[PDB]
Paper text:
As essential components in type II FAS systems, ACPs shuttle acyl intermediates in their hydrophobic pocket to facilitate interactions with various enzyme partners. ACPs consist of four helical bundles connected by three loop regions, forming hydrophobic cavities to accommodate the growing acyl chains. In this respect, [name] [name] (Tm-[name]) is a valuable target since [name] resides in extremely hot hydrothermal vents and is the only bacterium known to grow at temperatures up to 90 °C. Its thermophilic cell membrane is highly enriched in saturated fatty acids with long chain lengths, which help maintain their liquid crystalline states at high temperatures.
To function as a carrier for acyl groups, an apo Tm-[name] should be converted to the holo form, where the phosphopantetheine linker is covalently connected to the side chain of S40 in the conserved DSL motif. Both tertiary structures of the holo and apo forms of Tm-[name] were determined by NMR spectroscopy and X-ray crystallography, respectively (see associated statistics in Table 2). Compared to the structure of holo Ec-[name], the helix III of Tm-[name] was found to be protruded outward in both the apo and holo forms. Hyperthermophilic Tm-[name] has nonconserved Glu and Lys residues (D59 and K79), which participate in an ionic cluster between helices III and IV, forcing the outward protrusion of helix III. The Tm-[name] structure has extensive electrostatic interactions in four different regions. The interior of Tm-[name] is filled with numerous hydrophobic side chains, in which three Phe residues and I15 mediate the tight hydrophobic packing. The specific Tm of Tm-[name] was measured as 101.4 °C by DSC, which is the highest melting temperature for any [name] reported to date. For hyperthermophilic Tm-[name], the distances between the Cα atoms of the corresponding residues, L43, L63, and S67, were increased to 8.6 Å, 7.5 Å, and 9.1 Å, respectively, forming a much larger entrance. This would facilitate the entrance of long acyl chains into the hydrophobic pocket of Tm-[name].
Author numbering: 3 to 80
Amino acid sequence: SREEIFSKVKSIISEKLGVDESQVTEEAKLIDDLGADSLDLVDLVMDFESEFGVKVDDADLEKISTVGDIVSYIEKKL
Ligand SMILES: [Zn+2]
Ligand SMILES: [Zn+2]
Ligand SMILES: [Zn+2]
Ligand SMILES: [Zn+2]
């Protein structure tokens, strides 16, 4: 389930941020490592929301720092 979620999270991030999948690890920080900006994450989250059929709080968005954070947030909602 984590491996499923993480694989799909990684493809979406790679497709939309333009980075190579080899750079998308559990420990990668969206901004610092993968080159995103503070605007990119809300579109990513909505894409994850529609991908897995979950939704996230706007309050819980300020805590999301790494790829692993996204996966874990998704994994807990399902
Ligand atoms: Zn792949
Ligand atoms: Zn895709
Ligand atoms: Zn979107
Ligand atoms: Zn898909």
